[PDB]
Design a protein around this nucleic acid. Structure first.
Length: 737
DNA sequence: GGAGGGCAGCC
DNA sequence: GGCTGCCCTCC
């Protein structure tokens, strides 16, 4: 199985190294015959003799063009004859490409910025992470001595922990009577001991949590300070540090440095990305955090070191567990895109699509367009119109169905052949015209991107069907990941079209997809209203909520199924409307803000409860009470009385202070405070005394309860003044009113 | 009074 | 370092 590729230079010549793992043994294959190249479009074939003599200089030695050969490729569907220019070394390309481009007879140059090792995988048709080879993995973590105003790695590494199938162990230079702790004499000996473990275990994968920007950098500075050659690589090399924009990334030659931090950052959405929060969300099990202060205090006092060593052990243990959970998915992503797991795990959506397209382009003899220059990039900053959002019909509705399109944007791209190579093509026999924007797309030949997108959707169906027949639960999980990743990649094509740095960028394509989307959703709405008598309550981008005001629950379901059969017979190509769900009740307050409930009493809220900007228990409790009264009881006037009851109790100081605590996640803990009657007046709840102090009733009414509930009750016509404690009316003659 | 945070839609 | 639409808050 192919792990990764790179190149070394031997006597000025590039040598590709292919790192492989076959039959449980590590192998390095060498290729000294891969020639780097660039394409050049000339306005005259006679000019090739002038461009062959173009020279540049790379570190004293003269850079020259080895040889040139005329090649026929496709560029934007149309055939193109371009000159394939060969070079001795890949580093010759950045040195000479500008001199070649500036030549008068050169119209343009192409594929001049593609990394040599990645160009090799594509050109040779090699796919990394292919096969059933089982990789040996090892996770590791470090604990350090931290002091507030000191430089990076000024304090020593206190402990180094590691974990695999054999379990988790901790290496330290202090006596700890724990079964999993290995004691050495010094920090220098601890680092040397860690190196021996990695060498003896010889793992194919090194798993870290933020090892790209902390662990490796800390180990490097300490090994330099102590005089230890940090040889982690399979060929005796030290970890190589690279720049990824504003941050860093670390390679370990011969192995795969799998940093879980950038992976989990993309895959899962969490409020915080501490190792503790991540583990608790993925495995549902708690993990205690031991802060830098506690670690430093324990090491200096020499007391409480059991707790520190256990935290160190758990760090390696959970990092191995998480690595075991995310690596197989990243392995399938690597195999799908066709690039190393190291790169795919650190790449964003735009880069993943681009690498996929670059490989496909080579397979189809398609000349790839260049990345945009600074001038062209500034031309691509202009935006376009997106999805359709209907202003909701206010009020409480009963028996609601949600209908939506299955893969609307990929379906549009395939159905209408939306692509830069089909856009306004001359001599069209058949074309589809995008509404509003008016862009014409030829249908005579399959467009490059729609063709690939169709193959992806077809391949996904072939893997969904293979899942049903696979008994092996490990293989079924692997197929599940491949299937999921194909859907993710397919849904990235639309965004890629409007991505200014994309090689295959096409604003006309991007806005045509959204224009067609707006047409299909609006056409479907007027169709269900005029021909089936439905009321469309709300709609957002590719779906809508509809109902028949005075109809039975079974009647609305029947009519919805009949409508689905009707419009699906009219829809072109891959476009298809789906049932999605039925809801007993629902209210649509404003665009992006609504709430519905199914027949099982499950409530779904969007744009309302989601607002987690410092909310007291009293505001959360009454919002839930309001939501329940409206959706489960269907009683809007009861929800009003609840708010009036709560504001009256708050104004008369009858609400206990425990229900007034506000939680704010900020050194890195949740602060619990209360607002008093005396705007920077807030105090921690621990110091609040009901016998000595009074809370701000006005604040909890006007800034807590009312804002949270008004956003819901505004849909029914209630203002903020319709919910406060209006107080008893002045009855009798004594009042004189 | 703008700018922009943070959300919904991308089952 | 995939797209836009929109309600609401801070400045």
């Amino acid at each position: 199985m192919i792990l990764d590729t790179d190149y070394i230079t031997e006597d000025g010549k590039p040598v590709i190294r292919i790192f492989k793992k076959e039959n449980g043994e590590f192998k390095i294959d060498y290729d000294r015959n891969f020639e780097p190249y660039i394409y050049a479009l000339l306005k005259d074939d006679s000019a090739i003799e002038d461009v062959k003599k173009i020279t540049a200089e790379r570190h004293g030695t003269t850079v020259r063009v080895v040889r040139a050969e005329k090649v026929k490729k496709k560029f934007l569907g149309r055939p193109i004859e371009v000159w394939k220019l060969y070079f001795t070394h890949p580093q010759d390309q950045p040195a000479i490409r500008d001199k070649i481009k500036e030549h008068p007879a050169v119209v343009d140059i192409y594929e001049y910025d593609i990394p040599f090792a990645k160009r090799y995988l594509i050109d040779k048709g090699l796919i990394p992470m292919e096969g059933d080879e089982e990789l040996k993995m090892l996770a590791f973590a470090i604990a350090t001595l931290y002091h507030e105003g000191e430089e990076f790695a000024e304090g020593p590494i206190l402990m180094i922990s590691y974990a695999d199938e054999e379990g988790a162990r901790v290496i330290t230079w202090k006596n700890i009577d724990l079964p999993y702790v290995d004691v050495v004499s010094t920090e220098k000996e601890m680092i040397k001991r860690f190196l021996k473990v990695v060498k003896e275990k010889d793992p194919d994968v090194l798993i870290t949590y933020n090892g790209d920007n902390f662990d490796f950098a800390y180990l490097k500075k300490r090994s330099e300070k102590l005089g230890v050659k940090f040889i982690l690589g399979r060929e005796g090399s030290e970890p190589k540090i690279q720049r990824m924009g504003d941050r860093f990334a670390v390679e370990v030659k011969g192995r795969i440095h799998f940093d879980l931090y950038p992976v989990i950052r993309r895959t899962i959405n969490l409020p915080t990305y501490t190792l503790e929060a991540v583990y608790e969300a993925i495995f549902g099990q708690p993990k205690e955090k031991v802060y830098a202060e506690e670690i430093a205090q324990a090491w200096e006092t020499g007391e409480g070191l059991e707790r520190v060593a256990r935290y160190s052990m758990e760090d390696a243990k959970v990092t191995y567990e998480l690595g075991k959970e995310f690596f197989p998915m990243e392995a399938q992503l690597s195999r799908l895109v066709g690039q190393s797991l190291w790169d795919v795990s650190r790449s964003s959506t735009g880069n993943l699509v681009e690498w996929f397209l670059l490989r496909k382009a080579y397979e189809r003899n398609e000349l790839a367009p260049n990345k945009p220059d600074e001038r062209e990039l500034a031309r691509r900053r202009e935006s376009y119109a997106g999805g359709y959002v209907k202003e909701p019909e206010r009020g409480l509705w009963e028996n609601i169905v949600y209908l939506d399109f299955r893969s609307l944007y990929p379906s549009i791209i395939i159905t209408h052949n939306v692509s830069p190579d089909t856009l306004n093509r001359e001599g069209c026999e058949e074309y589809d015209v995008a509404p509003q924007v008016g862009h014409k797309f030829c249908k005579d030949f399959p467009g490059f991107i729609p063709s690939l997108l169709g193959d992806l959707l077809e391949e996904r169906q072939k893997v969904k069907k293979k899942m049903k027949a696979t008994i092996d639960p490990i293989e079924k999980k692997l197929l599940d990941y491949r299937q999921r990743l194909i859907k993710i990649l397919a849904n990235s094509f639309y965004g890629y079209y409007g991505y200014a740095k994309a090689r295959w960028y096409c604003k006309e394509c991007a806005e045509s997809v959204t224009a067609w989307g707006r047409q299909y959703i609006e056409t479907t709405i007027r169709e269900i209203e005029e021909k089936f008598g439905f009321k469309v309550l709300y709609a957002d981008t590719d779906g809508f909520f509809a109902t028949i005001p005075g109809a039975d629950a079974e009647t609305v379901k029947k009519k919805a199924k009949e409508f689905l059969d009707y419009i699906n017979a009219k829809l072109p190509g891959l476009l298809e409307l789906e049932y999605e769900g039925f809801y007993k009740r629902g209210f649509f307050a404003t665009k992006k803000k609504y709430a519905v409930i199914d027949e099982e009493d499950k409530i779904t809220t969007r744009g309302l409860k989601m607002v987690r900007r410092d909310w007291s228990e009293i505001a959360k409790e009454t919002q839930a009470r309001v939501l329940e009264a409206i959706l489960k009881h269907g009683d809007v006037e009861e929800a009003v009385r609840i708010v009036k009851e709560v504001t009256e109790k708050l104004s008369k100081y009858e609400v206990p202070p425990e229900q007034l605590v506000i939680y704010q996640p900020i050194p890195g803990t949740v602060i619990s405070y209360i607002v008093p009657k005396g705007g920077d007046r807030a105090i921690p709840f621990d110091e609040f005394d009901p016998a000595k102090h009074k809370y701000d009733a006005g604040y909890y009414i006007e800034n807590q309860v009312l804002p949270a509930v008004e956003r819901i009750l505004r849909a029914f016509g209630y203002r903020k003044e319709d919910l406060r404690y209006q107080k008893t009316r002045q009855v009798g003659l004594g009042a004189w009113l």
